[PDB]
Ligand binder design. Structure first.
Ligand SMILES: Cc1cc(O)nc2ccccc12
Ligand SMILES: [Zn+2]
Length: 209
């Protein structure tokens, strides 16, 4: 069902996606433990993910959420990092993509910081790093992130000192760091139909000079 369309680096669409990747790197309080040490990426490819069935599933749910929230989907573009990126683009988000041990409950997590999503590319806490070199900071192996369209509807705001169901009458959770003033928010959804994996970004983290 899914096809992947390569975007040309000359297309404005590739350019705005790359910009959202690069401009939302930040430093991490683990010193690079999970995701590696870097200030920027080498973007290698950006693909558009196309799946008629998955799209209609997303927009069906989006209209429902919109209806329960003063006609407002509260739709965002947010990063998602996971070892299951290949299953998500073909079969969609579902409960196996949920993070049972997560702070904001057992749901599917997205990040405004591309570098926060990068910490999950090889597993929770970076797992054991890349498959080939077991290196969480690997500068050689190609990584992949999704940049997804996410319906948040009415989002329960949970301040943070950094499959379950949304709090009653909410459609998602906003996990908002309240200590690190430069950390952007994370969002958790509890229905896989509330995210559509729009872009597939292949990249390397770059060793700082
Ligand atoms: C916080 C977070 C961001 C992300 O992009 N992926 C995750 C995948 C699993 C668990 C958490 C995650
Ligand atoms: Zn490697």
């Amino acid at each position: 069902g899914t096809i992947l369309i390569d975007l040309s680096p000359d297309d404005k669409e590739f350019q705005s996606v790359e910009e959202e990747m690069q401009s939302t790197v930040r430093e991490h309080r683990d010193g690079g433990h999970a995701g590696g040490i870097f200030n920027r990426y080498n973007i290698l490819k950006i693909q558009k993910v196309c799946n008629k069935k998955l799209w209609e599933r997303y927009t069906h749910r989006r209209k429902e959420v919109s209806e329960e929230n003063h006609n407002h989907a509260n739709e965002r573009m947010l990063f998602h990092g996971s070892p299951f990126v290949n299953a998500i683009i073909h079969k969609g988000f579902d409960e196996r993509h949920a993070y049972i041990g997560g702070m904001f409950g057992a749901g599917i997590y997205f990040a405004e910081n591309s570098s926060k999503s990068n910490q999950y590319v090889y597993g929770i806490g970076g797992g054991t790093g890349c498959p080939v070199h077991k290196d969480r900071s690997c500068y050689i192996c190609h990584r992949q992130l999704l940049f997804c369209r996410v319906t948040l509807g009415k989002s329960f705001l949970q301040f943070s000192a950094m499959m379950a169901h949304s709090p009653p009458g909410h459609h998602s959770v906003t996990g908002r760091p309240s200590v690190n003033g430069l950390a952007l928010a994370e969002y958790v959804i509890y229905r896989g139909e509330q995210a559509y994996p729009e872009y597939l970004i292949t990249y390397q983290i770059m060793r700082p000079e």
